């Protein structure tokens, strides 16, 4: 197996036990914003990068050679799974991903693999897992991640990013069944990714939700939500029956403030929050048993580093020392100083020592 | 290629001939006892400073601006093949190197790369060394460098400097497999980066074995000394097989008094010598088919000018005209006055040309 973990406050903290300080990384923390990302980037086209072992592990790396993280999230993408599928992706400038042949009626299912073997098709992603496990030597936590099954419902019905998600809202309220047909095939395809990526060494999972709050809550009460409660249980479920110990899970839902009660009991360890939600809001909604993760708007960081750490400071005192992992409440922005990234990151650790004495 | 070499002093002696005055450097030629040198590096840290071609270059060529010493040594660090074969280094301020997580069980060895791949991970030096090359213009030749096998390990299982390298001398008693395997990948990752220094322009190669002197005979012979023997012997035979021109090479084992008669065998036209041996006790020991490289005590520079004459001139007698090139005993310290760097650099030339006529 692997080194030794040397420090594992975020691991404590998402299992809901006391640290010593609040544990902080970034969502997107290997991202444009750093000058080196762009240089390694450069090499290849993004899906080529995700399939190099090596690139991957650079790219996790980065940002943990400038800032004090308590956690490294692996380089990768959501899509790889809709990919692994039989979906072609590409990834275009200043556009972002497009599928050029999306789903548009139920007979397109017929083009999917089936799902028992994406895990097989993902391989490259467990070796970049292995790789940056071994490279990191125990310094922090490895986190591995997929989509949730409604959000890469979204990517495959529109063909990339959309303002609205009309034409997948269309297939929920004209297309129930081909929709819960397509959202147990991703949850199938899903299952055995996120098991081979903890196999492969990741320490815990995030689950992103992203395109959550275009539903509202009948519509994801209905066609998100007990797929989200079908990942975290098989999941567990499959390490148990392998020998393995079970990972916290974490569950983002970007724009899921109506849902935040019913992602509290959906088997999750952890809960993420946007910057809309007020933290002593989520609280109340969620409960005292689940870790709550986030929420200083990104933009936050645009604001001078002494303004940032007045932020965090406000932000930490309305959370509580409990039960909290401080996050963005979603990825940096490419234009990000990465300065003042460091400066978020210093500012959670000095004030929530100065919270604990 | 590149500028015809014009003044070649250096590599006569190295290869043993006769020459007009004996050519003289100093280790750490380039370092903070210049004030250029820390207005240079106030700009990056110290691992992007080696990354720079233009930086690297800047600061070599930085001493022979002040003074006519017979030989460049490229700017860069004997750690970079550490942390190309996959290990993260940093440097810390009035501490030096640490690397962060240190190997330190067998299994540790699995984060390392293929040795075969650090060539690659290290075109940066190649860079410099072809830019430095050309900049010099044939001034005075170009020196390559690399840290010796055991010096490297004792980085690597140390995390940083030592005074008795305690931790790595009980791999070598409690894991003597695992040190040779250790060494081995260390070798094999040494040779192609010092063939590839020459082949980016490199006219003359040092190997740095700053930690013998913690060994000992017994544990210098099984663990040391087999490995400087065959970074000789495989860069020769590589540069041979390329169609190149080998290089003289140079073996400096600070504190290695017990090992001068081996390592005049070891296959290196130059042994470096420490100030600690006196240096016709030296010239007894190496024979008289090797030149010695030295050896002044670095805190001589210390003393007047006038002094400094006379430390050189006595150190010259004791050498005498033949298979010698002039240098400290250890490399320059950061307060050292530049003025008494010239001072020494003088007296090498005046007083050896004295010594011929
Ligand atoms: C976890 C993760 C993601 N992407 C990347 C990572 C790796 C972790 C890290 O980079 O630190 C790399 C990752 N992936 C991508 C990038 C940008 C790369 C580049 O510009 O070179 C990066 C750093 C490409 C990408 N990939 C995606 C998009 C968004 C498309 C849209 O506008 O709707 C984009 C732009 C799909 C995607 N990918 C991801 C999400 C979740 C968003 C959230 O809820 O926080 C989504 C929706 C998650
Ligand atoms: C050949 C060389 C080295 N370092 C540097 C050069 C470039 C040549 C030149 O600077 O003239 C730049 C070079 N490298 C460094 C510096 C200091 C830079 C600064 O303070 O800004 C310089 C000038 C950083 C450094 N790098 C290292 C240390 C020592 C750590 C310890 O205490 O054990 C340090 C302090 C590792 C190192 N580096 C080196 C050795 C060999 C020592 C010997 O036997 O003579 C070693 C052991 C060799």
Same mark, same amino acid.
């Given at each position: 197996?692997?080194?030794?973990?040397?420090?594992?406050?975020?691991?404590?903290?998402?299992?809901?036990? @006391?640290?010593?300080?609040?544990?902080?990384?970034?969502?997107?923390?290997?991202?444009?914003? +750093?000058?080196?990302?762009?240089?390694?980037?450069?090499?290849?086209?993004?899906?080529?990068?995700?399939?190099?072992?090596?690139?991957?592990?650079?790219?996790?790396?980065?940002?943990?050679?400038?800032?004090?993280?308590?956690?490294?999230?692996?380089?990768?993408?959501? +899509?790889?799974?809709?990919?692994? +599928?039989?979906?072609?992706?590409?990834?275009?400038?200043?556009?972002?991903?497009?599928?050029? @042949?999306?789903?548009?009626?139920?007979?397109?299912?017929?083009?999917?693999?089936?799902?028992?073997?994406?895990?097989?098709?993902?391989?490259?992603?467990?070796?970049?897992?292995?790789?940056?496990?071994?490279?990191?030597?125990?310094?922090?936590?490895?986190?591995?991640?997929?989509?949730?099954?409604?959000?890469?419902?979204?990517?495959?019905?529109?063909?990339?990013?959309?303002?609205?998600?009309?034409?997948?809202?269309?297939?929920?309220?004209?297309?129930?069944?081909?929709?819960?047909?397509?959202?147990?095939?991703?949850?199938?395809?899903?299952?055995?990714?996120?098991?081979?990526?903890?196999?492969?060494?990741?320490?815990?999972?995030?689950?992103?939700?992203?395109?959550?709050?275009?539903?509202?809550?009948?519509?994801?009460?209905?066609?998100?939500?007990?797929?989200?409660?079908?990942?975290?249980?098989?999941?567990?479920?499959?390490?148990?029956?392998?020998?393995?110990?079970?990972?916290?899970?974490?569950?983002?839902?970007?724009?899921?403030?109506?849902?935040?009660?019913?992602?509290?009991?959906?088997?999750?360890?952890?809960?993420?929050?946007?910057?809309?939600?007020?933290?002593?809001?989520?609280?109340?909604?969620?409960?005292?048993?689940?870790?709550?993760?986030?929420?200083?708007?990104?933009?936050?960081?645009?604001?001078?580093? @002494?303004?940032?750490?007045?932020?965090?400071?406000?932000?930490?005192?309305?959370?509580?020392?409990?039960?909290?992992?401080?996050?963005?409440?979603?990825? +940096?922005?490419?234009?990000?100083?990465?300065?003042?990234?460091?400066?978020?990151?210093?500012?959670?650790?000095?004030?929530?020592?100065?919270?604990?004495?």
């Amino acid at each position: 197996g692997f080194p030794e973990l040397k420090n594992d406050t975020f691991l404590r903290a998402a299992w809901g036990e @006391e640290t010593d300080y609040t544990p902080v990384w970034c969502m997107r923390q290997a991202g444009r914003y +750093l000058p080196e990302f762009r240089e390694t980037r450069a090499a290849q086209d993004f899906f080529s990068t995700c399939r190099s072992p090596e690139a991957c592990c650079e790219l996790t790396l980065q940002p943990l050679r400038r800032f004090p993280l308590d956690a490294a999230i692996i380089f990768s993408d959501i +899509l790889v799974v809709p990919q692994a +599928l039989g979906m072609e992706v590409t990834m275009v400038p200043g556009k972002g991903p497009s599928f050029p @042949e999306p789903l548009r009626e139920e007979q397109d299912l017929e083009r999917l693999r089936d799902p028992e073997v994406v895990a097989s098709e993902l391989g490259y992603v467990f070796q970049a897992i292995t790789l940056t496990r071994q490279r990191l030597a125990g310094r922090v936590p490895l986190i591995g991640f997929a989509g949730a099954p409604w959000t890469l419902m979204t990517y495959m019905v529109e063909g990339g990013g959309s303002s609205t998600m009309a034409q997948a809202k269309r297939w929920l309220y004209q297309r129930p069944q081909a929709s819960h047909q397509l959202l147990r095939i991703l949850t199938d395809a899903l299952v055995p990714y996120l098991v081979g990526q903890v196999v492969a060494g990741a320490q815990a999972l995030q689950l992103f939700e992203s395109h959550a709050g275009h539903l509202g809550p009948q519509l994801f009460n209905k066609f998100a939500l007990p797929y989200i409660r079908d990942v975290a249980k098989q999941v567990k479920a499959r390490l148990r029956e392998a020998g393995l110990a079970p990972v916290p899970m974490i569950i983002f839902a970007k724009d899921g403030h109506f849902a935040l009660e019913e992602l509290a009991q959906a088997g999750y360890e952890v809960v993420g929050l946007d910057w809309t939600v007020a933290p002593k809001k989520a609280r109340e909604c969620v409960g005292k048993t689940v870790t709550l993760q986030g929420n200083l708007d990104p933009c936050a960081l645009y604001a001078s580093e @002494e303004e940032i750490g007045q932020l965090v400071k406000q932000m930490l005192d309305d959370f509580g020392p409990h039960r909290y992992i401080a996050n963005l409440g979603h990825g +940096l922005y490419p234009d990000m100083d990465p300065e003042h990234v460091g400066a978020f990151v210093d500012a959670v650790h000095k004030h929530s020592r100065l919270l604990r004495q």
